[PDB]
């Protein structure tokens, strides 16, 4: 997260860290046994880490649970990043408490102008590299489809939305992939892609979760 602030230990209870020997992506806990992330975060041998703040220190509120199954959206296109969403099932159910809680799926799509909370352990520099060990947060509004399409000519599909600042300086970044974008207490987006990080006129592009609620519900119900 570039231009954000330190969330604070366990203030974002639904945030998960996907670990394969190291943190490679973020994700959101939607229920005791399912995690939603970006399809571009797909990898084998994923261990889901919950209750994390400092990912390099055991602080006492963590739950490390291996994934039993990963399901990448049936129409995921790795070249256009369209349908960049994936579901991960845990081998065992997480113990839900105040520090490890699930985020609700939306019943409707958030409109432009809505303020959202984005979080992750990704790079904090727009030029250069510096990964934080503790969770970073960023408040950012959803941009209109027009400004989004104008910033990214011919790349925005109906399954994507822009959020951030056209001025640049604040944005999600490498390592935040798969992370949550919460608006009105619901999971509305998934950190997907962008032209670099925090670049002027190049806001973050997020997977529009409200379009996948049916697929998510159906999948969970049969797996
Ligand atoms: C389809 O292939 C693509 C697509 C894009 C748009 C890019 S990019 O412009 O460099 N943008 C990168 C930026 C970067 O890697 O630093 C990106 O979107 N990366 C995301 C991570 C990310 C997400 C959001 C933001 C942001 N809000 N600005 C920045 C970075 C990523 O890891 N993947 C996996 C690899 C494929 C691209 C997406 C690249 C290199 C490839 C190969
Ligand atoms: Ca830790």
UniProtKB/Swiss-Prot annotation:
Disulphide-bridged cysteine pairs: 7-137, 25-41, 109-210, 116-183, 148-162, 173-197
Originating species: Bos taurus (Bovine)
Lineage of origin: Eukaryota, Metazoa, Chordata, Craniata, Vertebrata
Any GO MF annotation of the entry: metal ion binding
Pfam families, sorted: Trypsin (PF00089)
SMART domains in the cross-refs: Tryp_SPc
Self-association and partners: Interacts with SERPINA1.
Protein name as it appears in the record: Serine protease 1
Subcellular location: Secreted, Extracellular space
UniProt entry keywords in alphabetical sequence: Calcium, Digestion, Disulfide bond, Hydrolase, Metal-binding, Protease, Secreted, Serine protease, Signal, Zymogen
Cofactor binding comment, as recorded: Binds 1 Ca(2+) ion per subunit.
Family matches, as InterPro entries: Peptidase_S1_PA, Peptidase_S1_PA_chymotrypsin, Peptidase_S1A, Serine_Proteases_S1, Trypsin_dom, TRYPSIN_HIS, TRYPSIN_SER
Family: Belongs to the peptidase S1 family.
Enzyme type, top EC level: hydrolase
PTMs per UniProt: Subsequent cleavage after Lys-125 leads to alpha-trypsin. Further cleavage after Lys-170 yields pseudotrypsin. A cleavage may also occur after Arg-99. Not sulfated on tyrosine residue(s).
Gene for this chain: PRSS1
Binding site for Ca(2+): 52, 54, 57, 62
